[PDB]
């Protein structure tokens, strides 16, 4: 239902109690005109809404993935 | 480029109903459709719909009046009679 950008807010969601599960999605997409790049979406499933945050940058991507709560059930792909 | 010699608006009824009815109807049609001067704001925006009801395009005043025309002959000669008799009760 909802999309998210502020990366601080996203983290606070992952810790928001009722959030049991998240999921990470990977898609090949193209950069501007030319070559491709690896886009990755971070989907948190809340009680009444599903928040997803795109990280278009492969670098911020992985270093974000480790920051996830170890108590979270994360579905990879 | 005058389109009709006489019938005017009445040329919609064609050949039907006979001339003297169209004559009579045309007179009262030209009466009822035409735009009238607004007593209150003084633009000629007063038009009919629903016989006896005349309202103004802007300023949105509505006046009760004759069926096919804003002021009816009798209404006027009543308007002056009421002038007169009221002045008796003043002076």
């Amino acid at each position: 239902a909802r999309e998210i950008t502020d990366i601080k807010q996203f983290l606070e969601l992952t810790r928001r109690a009722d959030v049991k599960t998240a999921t990470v999605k990977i898609n090949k997409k193209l950069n501007k005109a030319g070559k491709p790049f690896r886009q990755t979406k971070f989907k948190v499933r809340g009680s009444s809404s599903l928040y997803t945050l795109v990280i278009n940058d492969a670098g911020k991507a992985k270093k974000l993935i480790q920051s996830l709560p170890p108590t979270l059930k994360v579905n990879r792909l | 480029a005058k389109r009709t010699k006489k019938v005017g608006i009445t040329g919609k009824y064609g050949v039907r109903y006979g001339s003297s009815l169209r004559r009579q109807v045309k007179k009262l049609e030209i009466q009822q459709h035409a735009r009238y001067d607004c007593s209150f704001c003084g633009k000629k925006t007063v038009k009919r719909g629903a016989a006896g009801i005349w309202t103004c395009s802007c300023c949105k005043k509505t006046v009760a009046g004759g069926a096919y025309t804003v002021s009816t002959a009798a209404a006027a000669t009543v308007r002056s009679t009421i002038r007169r008799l009221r002045e008796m009760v003043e002076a």
Binding site: - | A51, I53, A67, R79
Partner: protein
Amino acid sequence: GRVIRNQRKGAGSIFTSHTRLRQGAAKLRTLDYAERHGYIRGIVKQIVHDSGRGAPLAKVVFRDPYKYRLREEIFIANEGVHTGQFIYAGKKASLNVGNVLPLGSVPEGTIVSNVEEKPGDRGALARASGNYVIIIGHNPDENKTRVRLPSGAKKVISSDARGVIGVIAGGGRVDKPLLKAGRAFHKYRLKRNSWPKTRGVAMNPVDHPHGGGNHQHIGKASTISRGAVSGQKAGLIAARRTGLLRGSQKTQ
């Protein structure tokens, strides 16, 4: 023989009024303290078509003297009355088009609409588009006022019986020819089921006093007695004369 048409009209099946779209009963304000000792002011908030009625209605708004609230009345719009005008109803009210005053309080020659028969009956006489009554006099002891009705009649009512000053809006409506069956069709469609009309001379005997014959003819005088009986009265009832009226009519 059958039951003829004008008899069937009485039990009101298909003959009742087509009332759905009408704005309401048009009445003067209930005759209360304010109106009979004082006056009371209201604003006409609207003037509106009434379905099946040739004259507009004026929705007029008054304060409620005994409670905090607005009580809306429906007058019959007098010609020249307009939206936003202030209307004055009462014994002590001034004489201007649109105000409601007891007949006893206006000089003769005043022209007045929607006038009550008995005081407080919330209006009776001269309500159709274009009509009005005139005051032709007063007799202050046993206080009366004499009026000429639209019919030409003269009648004497109570000086407290209320009129409203002026004539009713929508006049001249009958001057315009209907021109075609449909315009009449659409007319009665909003009134009652009176249209069209079969000539009782084109029916069979079982149907009408005028029915039957090997030619269409009434066969006996079409002037019927006042003392006639239901199923007999079709014709010119109680007619005291007949034939084309030559000469001015105009009550003396």
